[PDB]
């Protein structure tokens, strides 16, 4: 509950501007650890924030996935809808 659905297109070089920590191999939830100024993650509707817990990536439940599996899902450009990365997050 209290979930926020964010869509964002990458910059011209394929970057979104956020960092993540966590994943199944780290025994902790996937959390946004940094959002860089002026990047898609900082300028989206609403902003992606540090501490937000990632629940879905492009509709996919990532609970049992490792950190690097989550990184590849973020970079999987063909799983985006209309070029937008979709994140379903829980604010801290």
């Amino acid at each position: 509950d209290n979930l926020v659905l964010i869509r964002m297109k990458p910059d011209e070089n394929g970057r979104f501007g956020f960092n993540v920590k966590g994943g199944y191999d780290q025994k902790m939830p996937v959390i946004v650890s940094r959002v860089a100024p002026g990047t898609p993650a900082d300028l989206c509707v609403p902003r992606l924030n540090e501490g937000d817990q990632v629940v879905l990536i492009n509709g996919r439940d990532i609970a049992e996935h490792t950190h690097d599996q989550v990184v590849l899902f973020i970079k999987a450009s063909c799983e985006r809808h209309s070029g937008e990365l979709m994140l379903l997050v829980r604010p801290n």
Binding site: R15, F16, G17, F18, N19, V20, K21, G22, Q26, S33, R34, H67, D68, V71, L72, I74, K75
Partner: peptide, 13 residues
């Protein structure tokens, strides 16, 4: 990993 910098278990996307 996946052509993104990883350090301290944190990846830049």
């Amino acid at each position: 990993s996946w052509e993104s910098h990883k350090s301290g278990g944190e990846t830049r996307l």
